[PDB]
Design an enzyme around this catalytic site. Structure first.
Site, mmCIF file in Angstrom:
data_model
loop_
_atom_site.group_PDB
_atom_site.id
_atom_site.type_symbol
_atom_site.label_atom_id
_atom_site.label_comp_id
_atom_site.label_asym_id
_atom_site.label_seq_id
_atom_site.Cartn_x
_atom_site.Cartn_y
_atom_site.Cartn_z
ATOM 1 N N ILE A 83 0.855 -1.195 0.000
ATOM 2 C CA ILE A 83 0.000 0.000 0.000
ATOM 3 C C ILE A 83 0.886 1.238 0.000
ATOM 4 O O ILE A 83 0.736 2.138 -0.809
ATOM 5 C CB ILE A 83 -0.951 0.008 1.197
ATOM 6 C CG1 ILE A 83 -1.832 -1.251 1.123
ATOM 7 C CG2 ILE A 83 -1.823 1.246 1.134
ATOM 8 C CD1 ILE A 83 -2.648 -1.495 2.358
ATOM 9 N N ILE A 84 1.850 1.257 0.903
ATOM 10 C CA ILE A 84 2.784 2.322 1.131
ATOM 11 C C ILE A 84 4.024 2.319 0.268
ATOM 12 O O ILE A 84 4.700 1.296 0.125
ATOM 13 C CB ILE A 84 3.205 2.242 2.627
ATOM 14 C CG1 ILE A 84 1.955 2.232 3.512
ATOM 15 C CG2 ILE A 84 4.123 3.396 2.986
ATOM 16 C CD1 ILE A 84 0.993 3.385 3.280
ATOM 17 N N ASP A 87 9.673 2.233 3.066
ATOM 18 C CA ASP A 87 10.864 1.443 3.318
ATOM 19 C C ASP A 87 10.789 0.059 2.707
ATOM 20 O O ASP A 87 11.768 -0.332 2.066
ATOM 21 C CB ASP A 87 11.185 1.342 4.823
ATOM 22 C CG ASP A 87 11.313 2.698 5.495
ATOM 23 O OD1 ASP A 87 11.804 3.679 4.883
ATOM 24 O OD2 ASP A 87 10.888 2.805 6.675
ATOM 25 N N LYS A 91 13.556 -1.056 -0.389
ATOM 26 C CA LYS A 91 14.408 -2.238 -0.316
ATOM 27 C C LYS A 91 14.324 -3.031 -1.616
ATOM 28 O O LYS A 91 15.373 -3.215 -2.251
ATOM 29 C CB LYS A 91 14.132 -3.088 0.911
ATOM 30 C CG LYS A 91 15.024 -4.320 1.039
ATOM 31 C CD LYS A 91 15.070 -4.844 2.473
ATOM 32 C CE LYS A 91 15.901 -6.120 2.563
ATOM 33 N NZ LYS A 91 15.312 -7.195 1.701
ATOM 34 N N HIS A 144 -1.848 -0.118 8.837
ATOM 35 C CA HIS A 144 -0.718 -0.695 9.501
ATOM 36 C C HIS A 144 0.591 -0.081 8.999
ATOM 37 O O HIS A 144 0.844 0.149 7.812
ATOM 38 C CB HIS A 144 -0.656 -2.209 9.248
ATOM 39 C CG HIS A 144 0.470 -2.798 10.051
ATOM 40 N ND1 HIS A 144 1.657 -3.250 9.514
ATOM 41 C CD2 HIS A 144 0.640 -2.795 11.395
ATOM 42 C CE1 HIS A 144 2.475 -3.604 10.487
ATOM 43 N NE2 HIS A 144 1.871 -3.362 11.640
ATOM 44 N N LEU A 201 -3.567 -5.119 2.566
ATOM 45 C CA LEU A 201 -3.650 -6.070 1.475
ATOM 46 C C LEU A 201 -4.359 -7.337 1.936
ATOM 47 O O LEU A 201 -5.325 -7.765 1.318
ATOM 48 C CB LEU A 201 -2.239 -6.396 0.922
ATOM 49 C CG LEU A 201 -2.294 -7.432 -0.218
ATOM 50 C CD1 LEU A 201 -2.766 -6.785 -1.517
ATOM 51 C CD2 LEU A 201 -0.961 -8.130 -0.393
ATOM 52 N N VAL A 202 -3.883 -7.967 3.010
ATOM 53 C CA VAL A 202 -4.501 -9.160 3.545
ATOM 54 C C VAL A 202 -5.044 -8.907 4.954
ATOM 55 O O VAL A 202 -4.585 -8.006 5.621
ATOM 56 C CB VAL A 202 -3.549 -10.372 3.670
ATOM 57 C CG1 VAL A 202 -2.929 -10.787 2.347
ATOM 58 C CG2 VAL A 202 -2.473 -10.108 4.721
#
Length: 257
Positions: A83-84, A87, A91, A144, A201-202
């Protein structure tokens, strides 16, 4: 010989995986009829758990691309199911850049919230899974992540909903915006009831335990104790076809760049 690599954080819960990850994987694969579909998870903990309990071997993004190069794939398109844009995603950005020399072409799409238009589109998508509301009712989304990328994104979404009068609010489990502030706020506005839906997502432990459960520390027990009856809707964002379509649009933007 072309490949499609779909990268997620991961989950060890098969049913929500099938309903969100696999569903996203399928739509992405299907929009690329000339590519072989491959998967990679990012969370070591999830990878290890699936391996010990189920015998399932899930590659990391580095192992997936090395195996793709060993299989002769020269062009790999990658979409991350995040979603974001923060970080985790950076990676993958690094790892892709590192292994670029093994391929003729490596392309990588971006997480859900990566521009003003993604926020606009995501709010249209969220409107599709919201139930019919009474005017004193609102949907409350549970995000989250505590990084600065994640909470600013949640705040921004809350900021846009509120300004535009979208009948929903966004909070983030043990992050910001804070659900206690939100509860107070919804109570002072005359909110009668809320629909709790994961902005994830889940639907993992955060959604099952922290959001929807009967423990006194869950968001729905805390809405209830504030006199605002809460109805949990345990579905990941991958179950919403408008969200799956955003992932597809991002894969094709990256391919088209």
């Amino acid at each position: 010989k072309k490949a499609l690599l779909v990268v997620s954080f991961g989950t060890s819960y098969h049913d929500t995986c099938e309903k969100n990850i696999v569903a996203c994987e399928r739509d992405l694969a299907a929009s690329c009829p000339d590519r072989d579909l491959f998967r990679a998870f990012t969370s070591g903990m999830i990878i290890r758990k699936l391996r010990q309990r189920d015998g399932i071997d899930i590659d990391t993004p580095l192992q997936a691309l090395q195996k793709l190069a060993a299989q002769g794939y020269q062009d790999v398109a990658i979409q991350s199911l995040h979603i974001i844009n923060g970080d985790e995603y950076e990676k993958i950005v690094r790892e892709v850049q590192l292994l670029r020399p093994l391929f003729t072409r490596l392309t990588l799409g971006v997480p859900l919230l990566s521009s003003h238009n993604d926020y606009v589109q995501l709010m249209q998508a969220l409107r599709q899974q919201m139930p019919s509301l009474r005017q004193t009712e609102k949907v409350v989304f549970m995000g989250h992540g505590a990084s600065h990328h994640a909470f600013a994104a949640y705040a921004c979404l809350d900021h846009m909903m509120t300004a535009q009068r979208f009948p929903a609010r966004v909070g983030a489990v043990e992050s910001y915006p804070e659900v206690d502030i939100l509860i107070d706020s919804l109570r002072d506005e005359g909110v009668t009831g809320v629909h709790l839906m994961p902005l994830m997502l889940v639907a993992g432990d955060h959604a099952i335990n922290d959001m929807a459960s009967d423990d006194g520390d869950s968001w729905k027990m805390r809405f209830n104790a504030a006199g605002i009856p809460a109805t949990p809707w345990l579905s990941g964002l991958g179950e919403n076809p408008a969200i799956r379509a955003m992932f597809v649009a991002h894969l094709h933007q990256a391919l088209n760049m």
